[PDB]
Design brief:
The structure is cut from a larger assembly and holds eight protein chains of eight kinds.
Chain A lengths: L9 E3 L2 E3 L2 H11 L1
Antiparallel strand pairs in A: 1-2
Chain C lengths: L6 E4 L8 E6 L6 E6 L4 E5 L8 E3 L9 E3 L5 E3 L5 E4 L12 E3 L5 E6 L5 E6 L3 E6 L7 E4 L7 E6 L6 E6 L3 E6 L4 E7 L4 E6 L6 E6 L3 E6 L8 E4 L5 E6 L5 E6 L4 E5 L7 E3 L7 E6 L5 E6 L4 E5 L11 H17 L3 H8 L4
Antiparallel strand pairs in C: 1-28, 2-3, 3-4, 4-5, 6-7, 7-8, 8-9, 10-11, 11-12, 12-13, 14-15, 15-16, 16-17, 18-19, 19-20, 20-21, 22-23, 23-24, 24-25, 26-27, 27-28
Chain D lengths: L13 H7 L11 H7 L20
The chains are: A alpha+beta (about 30), B alpha+beta (about 50), C mainly beta (about 350), D mainly alpha (about 60), E mainly alpha (about 50), F alpha/beta (about 160), G mainly alpha (about 70), H alpha+beta (about 130).
The complex binds zinc ion (ZN).
The structure holds two RNA strands.
Chain lengths: ~30, ~50, ~350, ~60, ~50, ~160, ~70, ~130
RNA sequence: GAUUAAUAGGGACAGUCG
RNA sequence: GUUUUCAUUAAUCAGGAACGUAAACUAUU
C-alpha cells in the first residue's frame, strides 16, 4: 500500500472525501 | 535509535514513492552505523 | 568495459531533503559545500568523507545558490536573502557575519577569480555586484527594460570582468563589469537552465537548456552554436566544464550524468543508479579526474571520469599498456565489433 | 565484419584513410622511441590544482 | 582490417545525399512474365527505335 | 466643461482651435470639442509627455482620426510625446485605461508573473503586426500608466 | 427567439409525422425536442419574459402557425 | 463534471509531479487556486507561476513536492482541533502543510498558529 | 440602471456528410 | 466554418415514459 496516503478518509485523485463521522471522530478525540 | 546503511540503502532502492519515509529515516538526530560488507542485504546485516 | 567501475563513494550521511545547490572551492582542492532543500548547508572535506566538517540551518526555503569566497568564507542565497559564514574558525559559529535582503529574491551566486567581488543573480531581472569589505548594497546592473528572472550567473574565470547570465525569457545576456552595463542579449528557442564558461578558452560558453541540450557558443559571434551536445532524455539541469577545459559533465532531470568531450556532440559516458533520484548539480574536482553529483535524494556522490582508468602511481609498463590501449582504440575504434562493444552501456 | 562500413568523420577519401593508418602502433613493429612518441596522449594531466589560465601564453 | 566496405560506403552516401543492351534487356525480361512498368517504358523505347 | 485654464491648457486648446483653419481640409471631431483637460508630468529624466483627457463618446470620435493628428501634435507642439485618453473616476476602469493608452495597437494578453516570493510583476504584451514605431513609446506608456494608476506594468512585444 | 425556432422545429416534425405515421426515429426526435422546449420554456418562465399561464401542448402550435 | 476547479488544478499538479514534467497548463483559473499556489510558493514546493489570459496558469515546479489534495466537505476547525487535524493529515508534523481559509485569508497552519486564528480546512500539500 | 463571454450550454446561417 | 445571438439556462439519476430458437473457448497517458 502507499505510504503517503493519509489516514482520515478515502482519496480519489486529488480529492479527499471525509465522511461526517470522521470529522466528528477527530472532534471527539480532541475533547 | 539506529539505522544501518543497508536499511538506508533499501529505502533508497525503493522508488520515489517512498520519499517521505526516506526523509523520515534521514532525520539527523539518529545514529548511522556504517556497514563494512558487500551485498547491502538488511536482514543478514542486522543478524550479523 | 569490464573494468568500467565509476562509482567511488558518497559524502557522509548526505542531506535530509535533496541537494539543490553545491559549490567547490576553486582555490583549495578538498573543500566542498552543499545546501539542501530544507535550508541546511554543509561544508565537506574530501579527504575525510565520513562526516561533515561544518553544518548550519542556514535559511527557511531551499538554498538556491552557494559559493566560496577567495579568502575562506562561504556565501549562500535563498529567497530569504544571501548570507555569509566563516566555516573554518577555531570556534564553530552558526551565526552569519553578514546578510543581505534588499535587491529582490536572489537566485544564484558567482565569485570573482582574483578580487573579493561577487555577483548575485536576483529575480527582478538584474544582477547585482558587491565588493566585500567596502560595499554594502552593491551595484545593480540590468538590461534596461527587463522583467523575467535571471536564473544563473557565472563570472568568466579566464577573462575577468565578463559576466554571463541566462534568463527565463529563453535568453542569454552578457555583462561587462569594467563599464557597468549589459552587452548583448540573444533569445534561444527553449529556456536555458545554466550558463558556464570554458576555463581554458576565454570566449566559449555552454548553456544547459530545457531543449534536452547543451549549446557551446562563442561569446564574440552569437550567430550560431559552436557545438550542440544532444544526448539526454529529460531536461539538463547542470553543466560544468572540466578544469582542463576539454570535457563536460551534465546532470539531467532524469536520473543521468553524461560525460562529454568538447568536440564530441554525443555521450562519452552515462552514469546512473537506482538510488539516485534526480540530478541537480554536477561539478568536477580540481583534479579533473573525479566528478561530484548533488542529487534530489539528498546525496552528494563522488564518481570518477574516465571510469576504467584507476588513479595513483603506475609503473611504466602499466601506464604504457594503458596508453597503448587508448591509442589503439583511437585508431581502430570505428570497426563494427569494437564499435558495438565500446558503445554498449546499460541504461 | 573486419572491413569498415563507412569513412570516419575527418577523412574525405578512401585512399586518404586506408593509407593514413598504414603503420602498426605496437612495440613489436616500431622502436621504443617511436612507440613512446606515438602513444603519448594528447592531453597530459598531472596532479594538482588545474586553475584556469591567468594571462595569455601566446 | 580497416579498409573500406565500398558497397556500404556508396549506400551510406546515397542515403545521405537523398541500343545494344536494351534489346537483351527485353530478351531477359520477356521470360518472367511480369510486366513491370519499366518494361513498358522499354517497349515504347524499342518501338521508337 | 470642468476647467479654468492652466498655463498650457490654453496652448493645447489653441492648437485644437488652430487645426480647424489655416491647415487641412480635415475636421470631424475638431469643431465639436472645447477645452477638455490636460496634464504635464515627467517621463524618464529630461523629457516629458503631454496627456489630454477626452469625453467618453469622443474617444471613438477620436478613434475615427488619430493618424497624422498626433504627428502634427508632436511636431507643431513642444516636441514631446502626445497622448490622448478618456477621463474617468475599478479593475475594469484600469483595463480601460490600458486599452485606451495603446491607440493603434491591440493588446493581446496580460501575464501576471509572480516571483519566488510574494512579489508579482504584471506584463502586458502587444500585437506583433505593429512593432517599429511603438518601442520608443513603450516606456512612456508604462510611466504614464504608473503615474495615473499606481500599478507598475511593463510593455513588451512577444517574441 | 430560441424558443420560437424550437417550436417551429416541433411543428415541422409533427406535421411530417402526421403525414407518414409509420416511422419511430421522428417520434424519438419529437420526444427529445419537446423535452428541450419544456426545459427552455421553464427557464424563461422562472425569468418571467413570457406569461406564466402560457402553455404549449399542441394548441399553441396550432394557434402560432395559424 | 467536477465543479471543484481547485481539485482539477491539483489533479494536474499531481500528474505533473508524478510524470516528471517541469510545467503545467492549468486551464481553468481562479483566485483560490492562485492563493493555494501562493502558499506552495512561500514554502518552496513550486518555483514560479504566471496567469496568462485568453485565462490559464503556467506553473514552473521544482520537483520537490509529493502530493496535493483538497478536503472536499471543508470542515470547520479550531486550534485545539487543528493540532490533531495536522497530525492526522500529514505523514509528519515537520513535513508538509495544511491549508486554511481563515478570516485572515488563506494560509498554512504555521501561519495560522502565528496569527492565532482558526477556520475551515480547504487543502493540504506535502 | 445591463461583468468576464465559459477551454459547459441551446439556437441561427452556409457548404456539406452519412 | 462564421464578421451569430438569451447568459445559467447546466451535470446526475428515486417515480415514470418512448423505442426491442439462443449460448458453447474467452486531469493526462
Ligand atoms: Zn551492513
Amino acid at each position: 500500500r502507499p505510504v503517503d496516503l493519509p489516514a482520515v478518509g478515502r482519496m480519489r485523485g486529488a480529492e479527499l472525501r471525509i465522511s461526517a463521522k470522521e470529522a466528528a471522530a477527530i472532534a471527539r478525540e480532541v475533547r | 535509535i539506529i539505522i544501518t546503511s543497508c536499511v538506508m540503502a533499501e529505502l533508497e532502492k525503493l522508488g520515489p514513492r517512498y520519499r517521505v519515509a526516506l526523509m523520515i529515516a534521514r532525520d539527523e538526530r539518529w545514529q548511522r552505523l556504517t556497514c563494512d560488507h558487500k551485498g547491502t542485504y538488511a536482514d543478514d546485516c542486522i543478524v550479523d | 568495459r569490464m573494468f568500467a567501475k565509476p562509482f567511488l563513494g558518497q559524502l557522509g550521511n548526505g542531506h535530509v531533503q535533496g541537494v539543490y545547490s553545491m559549490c567547490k572551492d576553486k582555490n583549495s582542492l578538498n573543500c566542498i559545500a552543499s545546501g539542501s532543500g530544507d535550508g541546511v548547508v554543509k561544508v565537506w572535506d574530501l579527504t575525510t568523507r565520513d562526516e561533515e566538517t561544518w553544518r548550519v540551518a542556514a535559511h527557511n526555503n531551499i538554498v538556491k545558490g552557494l559559493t566560496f569566497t577567495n579568502d575562506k568564507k562561504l556565501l549562500s542565497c535563498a529567497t530569504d536573502g544571501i548570507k555569509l559564514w566563516d566555516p573554518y574558525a577555531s570556534p564553530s559559529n552558526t551565526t552569519p557575519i553578514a546578510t543581505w535582503q534588499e535587491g529582490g529574491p536572489y537566485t544564484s551566486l558567482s565569485f570573482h577569480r582574483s578580487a573579493n567581488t561577487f555577483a548575485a543573480s536576483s529575480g527582478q531581472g538584474c544582477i547585482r555586484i558587491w565588493d566585500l569589505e567596502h560595499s554594502t548594497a552593491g551595484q545593480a546592473i540590468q538590461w534596461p527594460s527587463f522583467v523575467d528572472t535571471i536564473t544563473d550567473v557565472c563570472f568568466n574565470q579566464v577573462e575577468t570582468s565578463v559576466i554571463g547570465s541566462v534568463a527565463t525569457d529563453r535568453s542569454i545576456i552578457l555583462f561587462d563589469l569594467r563599464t557597468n552595463m549589459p552587452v548583448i542579449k540573444t533569445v534561444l528557442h527553449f529556456a536555458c537552465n545554466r550558463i558556464v564558461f570554458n576555463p581554458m578558452e576565454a570566449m566559449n560558453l555552454a548553456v544547459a537548456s530545457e531543449d534536452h541540450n547543451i549549446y557551446i557558443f562563442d561569446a564574440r559571434n552569437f550567430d550560431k552554436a559552436l557545438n550542440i551536445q544532444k544526448g539526454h532524455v529529460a531536461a539538463v539541469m547542470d553543466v560544468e566544464f572540466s578544469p582542463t577545459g576539454e570535457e563536460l559533465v551534465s546532470g539531467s532531470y532524469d536520473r543521468t550524468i553524461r560525460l562529454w568531450r568538447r568536440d564530441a556532440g554525443h555521450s562519452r559516458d552515462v552514469y546512473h543508479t537506482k538510488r539516485m533520484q534526480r540530478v541537480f548539480r554536477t561539478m568536477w574536482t580540481m583534479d579533473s579526474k573525479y566528478i561530484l553529483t548533488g542529487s534530489d535524494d539528498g546525496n552528494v556522490r563522488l564518481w570518477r571520469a574516465n571510469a576504467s582508468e584507476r588513479s595513483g602511481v603506475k609503473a611504466t609498463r602499466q601506464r604504457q599498456a594503458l596508453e597503448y590501449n587508448n591509442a589503439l582504440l583511437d585508431r581502430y575504434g570505428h570497426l563494427p565489433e569494437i564499435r558495438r562493444i565500446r558503445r554498449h552501456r546499460h541504461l | 565484419k573486419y572491413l569498415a562500413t563507412g569513412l570516419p568523420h575527418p577523412f574525405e577519401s578512401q585512399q586518404q584513410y586506408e593509407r593514413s593508418l598504414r603503420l602498426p602502433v605496437g612495440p613489436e613493429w616500431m622502436t621504443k622511441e617511436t612507440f613512446q612518441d606515438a602513444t603519448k596522449p594528447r592531453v597530459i594531466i598531472k596532479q594538482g590544482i588545474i586553475a584556469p589560465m591567468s594571462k595569455p601564453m601566446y | 582490417i580497416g579498409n573500406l566496405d565500398l558497397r556500404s560506403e556508396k549506400q551510406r552516401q546515397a542515403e545521405r545525399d537523398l541500343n545494344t543492351a536494351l534489346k537483351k534487356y527485353l530478351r531477359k525480361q520477356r521470360k518472367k512474365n511480369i510486366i513491370d512498368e519499366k518494361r513498358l517504358k522499354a517497349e515504347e523505347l524499342y518501338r521508337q527505335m | 466643461s470642468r476647467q479654468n485654464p492652466s498655463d498650457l491648457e490654453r496652448a493645447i486648446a489653441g492648437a485644437l482651435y488652430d487645426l480647424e483653419t489655416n491647415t487641412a481640409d480635415l475636421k470631424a471631431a475638431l469643431r465639436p470639442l472645447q477645452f477638455v483637460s490636460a496634464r504635464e508630468i515627467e517621463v524618464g529624466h529630461g523629457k516629458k509627455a503631454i496627456v489630454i483627457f477626452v469625453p467618453v463618446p469622443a474617444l471613438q470620435g477620436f478613434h475615427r482620426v488619430q493618424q497624422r493628428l498626433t504627428r502634427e501634435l508632436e511636431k507643431k507642439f513642444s516636441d514631446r510625446h502626445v497622448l490622448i485618453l478618456a477621463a474617468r473616476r475599478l479593475t475594469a476602469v484600469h483595463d480601460a485605461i490600458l486599452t485606451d493608452l495603446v491607440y493603434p495597437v491591440e493588446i493581446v494578453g496580460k501575464r501576471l508573473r509572480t516571483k519566488e516570493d510574494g512579489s508579482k510583476v504584471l506584463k502586458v504584451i502587444l500585437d506583433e503586426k505593429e512593432r517599429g514605431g511603438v518601442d520608443y513609446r513603450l516606456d512612456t506608456y508604462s510611466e504614464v500608466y504608473r503615474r495615473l494608476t499606481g500599478r507598475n506594468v511593463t510593455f513588451e512585444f512577444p517574441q | 427567439e430560441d424558443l420560437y425556432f424550437l417550436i417551429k422545429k416541433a411543428v415541422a416534425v409533427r406535421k411530417h409525422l402526421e403525414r407518414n405515421r409509420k416511422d419511430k426515429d421522428s417520434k424519438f426526435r419529437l420526444i427529445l425536442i419537446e423535452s428541450r422546449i419544456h426545459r427552455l420554456a421553464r427557464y424563461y418562465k422562472t425569468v418571467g419574459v413570457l406569461p406564466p399561464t402560457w402553455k404549449y401542448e399542441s394548441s399553441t402550435a396550432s394557434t402560432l402557425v395559424a | 463534471v467536477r465543479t471543484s476547479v481547485l481539485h482539477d488544478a491539483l489533479n494536474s499538479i499531481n500528474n505533473a509531479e508524478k510524470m516528471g514534467k517541469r510545467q503545467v497548463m492549468i486551464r481553468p483559473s481562479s483566485k483560490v487556486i492562485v492563493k493555494f499556489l501562493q502558499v506552495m510558493q512561500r514554502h518552496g514546493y513550486i518555483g514560479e507561476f504566471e496567469e496568462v489570459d485568453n485565462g490559464k496558469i503556467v506553473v514552473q515546479l521544482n520537483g520537490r513536492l509529493n502530493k496535493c489534495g483538497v478536503i472536499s466537505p471543508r470542515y470547520n476547525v479550531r486550534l485545539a482541533e487543528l493540532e490533531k487535524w495536522v497530525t492526522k493529515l500529514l505523514p509528519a508534523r515537520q513535513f508538509g502543510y495544511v491549508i486554511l481559509t481563515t478570516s485572515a485569508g488563506i494560509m498554512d497552519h504555521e501561519e495560522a498558529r502565528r496569527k492565532h486564528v482558526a477556520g475551515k480546512i480547504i487543502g493540504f500539500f506535502y
